[PDB]
Write an enzyme that holds these catalytic residues in place. Structure first.
Site, PDB file in Angstrom:
ATOM      1  N   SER A   1       0.838  -1.204   0.000  1.00 24.58           N
ATOM      2  CA  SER A   1       0.000   0.000   0.000  1.00 24.58           C
ATOM      3  C   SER A   1       0.873   1.254   0.000  1.00 24.58           C
ATOM      4  CB  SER A   1      -0.910   0.033   1.231  1.00 24.58           C
ATOM      5  OG  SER A   1      -1.794  -1.072   1.318  1.00 24.58           O
TER       6      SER A   1
ATOM      7  N   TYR B   1      18.857  -8.579   2.012  1.00 27.93           N
ATOM      8  CA  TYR B   1      18.348  -9.198   0.790  1.00 27.93           C
ATOM      9  C   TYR B   1      18.316 -10.733   0.991  1.00 27.93           C
ATOM     10  CZ  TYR B   1      18.071 -10.868  -4.069  1.00 27.93           C
ATOM     11  OH  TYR B   1      17.669 -11.503  -5.220  1.00 27.93           O
TER      12      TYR B   1
ATOM     13  N   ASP C   1       1.242  -9.981  12.146  1.00 26.77           N
ATOM     14  CA  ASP C   1       0.976 -10.292  10.745  1.00 26.77           C
ATOM     15  C   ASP C   1       1.896 -11.389  10.223  1.00 26.77           C
ATOM     16  OD1 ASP C   1      -0.470 -10.179   8.372  1.00 26.77           O
ATOM     17  OD2 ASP C   1       0.742  -8.541   7.539  1.00 26.77           O
TER      18      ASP C   1
ATOM     19  N   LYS D   1       3.081 -14.636   8.573  1.00 25.63           N
ATOM     20  CA  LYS D   1       2.599 -15.471   7.474  1.00 25.63           C
ATOM     21  C   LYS D   1       3.774 -15.978   6.626  1.00 25.63           C
ATOM     22  CE  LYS D   1       1.026 -11.588   4.404  1.00 25.63           C
ATOM     23  NZ  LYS D   1      -0.105 -11.234   3.489  1.00 25.63           N
TER      24      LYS D   1
ATOM     25  N   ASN E   1       6.102 -13.500   4.766  1.00 20.67           N
ATOM     26  CA  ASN E   1       6.981 -12.681   5.615  1.00 20.67           C
ATOM     27  C   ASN E   1       8.203 -13.465   6.066  1.00 20.67           C
ATOM     28  OD1 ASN E   1       5.007 -10.670   5.535  1.00 20.67           O
ATOM     29  ND2 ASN E   1       4.610 -10.726   7.716  1.00 20.67           N
TER      30      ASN E   1
ATOM     31  N   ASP F   1       8.702  -7.698   7.251  1.00 16.59           N
ATOM     32  CA  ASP F   1       7.426  -6.951   7.319  1.00 16.59           C
ATOM     33  C   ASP F   1       7.080  -6.523   8.752  1.00 16.59           C
ATOM     34  OD1 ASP F   1       4.925  -5.725   6.631  1.00 16.59           O
ATOM     35  OD2 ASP F   1       3.887  -7.676   6.447  1.00 16.59           O
TER      36      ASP F   1
ATOM     37  N   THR G   1      -3.511 -10.394   8.006  1.00 15.00           N
ATOM     38  CA  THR G   1      -4.023 -11.176   6.881  1.00 15.00           C
ATOM     39  C   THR G   1      -5.057 -12.184   7.341  1.00 15.00           C
ATOM     40  OG1 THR G   1      -1.897 -10.881   5.805  1.00 15.00           O
ATOM     41  CG2 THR G   1      -3.365 -12.528   4.800  1.00 15.00           C
TER      42      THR G   1
HETATM   43  C1  LIG Z   1       6.311  -7.931   1.841  1.00 11.99           C
HETATM   44  C2  LIG Z   1       7.341  -7.189   1.014  1.00 11.99           C
HETATM   45  C3  LIG Z   1       8.601  -7.016   1.811  1.00 11.99           C
HETATM   46  C4  LIG Z   1       9.765  -7.670   1.471  1.00 11.99           C
HETATM   47  C5  LIG Z   1      10.883  -7.474   2.270  1.00 11.99           C
HETATM   48  C6  LIG Z   1      12.202  -8.062   1.999  1.00 11.99           C
HETATM   49  C7  LIG Z   1      13.309  -7.724   2.658  1.00 11.99           C
HETATM   50  N1  LIG Z   1      14.355  -8.383   2.163  1.00 11.99           N
HETATM   51  C8  LIG Z   1      13.980  -9.189   1.147  1.00 11.99           C
HETATM   52  N2  LIG Z   1      14.649 -10.007   0.365  1.00 11.99           N
HETATM   53  C9  LIG Z   1      14.079 -10.696  -0.554  1.00 11.99           C
HETATM   54  C10 LIG Z   1      12.717 -10.590  -0.784  1.00 11.99           C
HETATM   55  C11 LIG Z   1      12.109 -11.390  -1.860  1.00 11.99           C
HETATM   56  C12 LIG Z   1      10.761 -11.669  -2.021  1.00 11.99           C
HETATM   57  N3  LIG Z   1      10.604 -12.404  -3.063  1.00 11.99           N
HETATM   58  N4  LIG Z   1      11.849 -12.613  -3.607  1.00 11.99           N
HETATM   59  C13 LIG Z   1      12.757 -11.994  -2.861  1.00 11.99           C
HETATM   60  C14 LIG Z   1      11.958  -9.734   0.002  1.00 11.99           C
HETATM   61  C15 LIG Z   1      12.609  -9.027   0.992  1.00 11.99           C
HETATM   62  N5  LIG Z   1      10.786  -6.672   3.294  1.00 11.99           N
HETATM   63  C16 LIG Z   1       9.669  -6.088   3.579  1.00 11.99           C
HETATM   64  N6  LIG Z   1       9.631  -5.283   4.684  1.00 11.99           N
HETATM   65  N7  LIG Z   1       8.584  -6.247   2.870  1.00 11.99           N
END
Ligand SMILES: CCc1cc(-c2c[nH]c3ncc(-c4cn[nH]c4)cc23)nc(N)n1
Length: 273
Positions: free
Chosen positions: A17, A86, A130, A132, A135, A148, A160
């Site tokens: 959002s 990451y 939250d 799930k 996350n 998250d 959720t």
């Molecule tokens: C809900 C979106 C979100 C994502 C992240 C996040 C932090 N590090 C990440 N490293 C990889 C991925 C990822 C997801 N799919 N492929 C790679 C997501 C993250 N952090 C927050 N706070 N929110």
């Protein structure tokens, strides 16, 4: 202090959002971070300043491998940037969807780290609200990394639909037991493949939740079933792992975990999926 011109932005790693997480490479060091970019005006217009403030306050106090770290935060004239870890293997939900359902070892390993992470978090007085499989992410080494923290509470909000708890659909009050319910929901999903409560719309799910309207597949690990029945109790004070039930000790002591060695989980080799 870091700037946007210090990075090479890549693909989007997840939207929201008020946020968008972008894969970004730092130029000087060549390290890859997942940057959460938030537009200042959408936050103000939608009264989210206490929710962003909280996230930064919450993340800056986590120091555990099972959580995503905040490395830096910087801003420009219109956007906020929270530089985060990451997690290359992405969401846990994907691995569930691609393998169908986890074997007992894989459910024991991943449930243990999730269980281990919530003991640190709740040990600090922070509640996710939250939790799930979207996350709970997986790093290069395939260990979980929980993210998250926008809706996190330090001891008003509802998470959720599929992982919500009766107490939230009644009292309007989330406690650590709200996380233990989500945990209960996530275990079912690791063994079974699908969340416990499923229906045509949000109202029918909520009605299926409050009535405890769920039934285990005939090939569910019995120890895992007994543990699920213990976390998925309507009465929040009767939830394994809660303070009224004497905390994590007994949860950690449950038969499903007989062979688990909680002390060095992050130093252990995760099983192959
Ligand atoms: C809900 C979106 C979100 C994502 C992240 C996040 C932090 N590090 C990440 N490293 C990889 C991925 C990822 C997801 N799919 N492929 C790679 C997501 C993250 N952090 C927050 N706070 N929110």
């Amino acid at each position: 202090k870091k700037r946007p011109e210090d990075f090479k932005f890549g693909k989007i790693l997840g939207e929201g959002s008020f946020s968008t997480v972008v894969l970004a490479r730092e130029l000087a060091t060549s390290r890859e971070y997942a940057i959460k970019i938030l537009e200042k005006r959408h936050i103000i217009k939608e009264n989210k300043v206490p929710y962003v403030t909280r996230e930064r306050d919450v993340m800056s106090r986590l120091d555990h491998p099972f959580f995503v770290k905040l490395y830096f935060t910087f801003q420009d004239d219109e956007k906020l940037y929270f530089g985060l870890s990451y997690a290359k293997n992405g969401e846990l939900l994907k691995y569930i969807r691609k393998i169908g359902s986890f074997d007992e070892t894989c459910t024991r390993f991943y449930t243990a780290e999730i269980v281990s992470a919530l003991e640190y978090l709740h040990g600090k007085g922070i509640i996710h609200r939250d939790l799930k499989p979207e996350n709970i992410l997986l790093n290069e080494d395939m260990h979980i990394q929980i993210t998250d923290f926008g809706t996190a509470k330090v001891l008003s909000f509802v998470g959720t639909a599929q992982y919500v708890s009766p107490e939230l659909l009644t009292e309007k009050s989330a406690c650590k037991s709200s996380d233990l319910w989500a945990l209960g929901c996530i275990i079912y999903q690791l063994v079974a493949g699908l969340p416990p409560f499923r229906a045509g719309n949000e109202y029918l799910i909520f009605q299926k939740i409050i009535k405890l309207e769920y039934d285990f597949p005939e090939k569910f690990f019995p120890k895992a079933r007994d543990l699920v029945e213990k976390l998925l109790v309507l009465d929040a004070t009767k939830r394994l792992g809660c303070e009224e039930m004497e905390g994590y000790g007994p949860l950690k002591a449950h038969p499903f975990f007989e062979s688990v060695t909680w002390e060095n989980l992050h130093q252990q080799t995760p099983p192959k999926l």
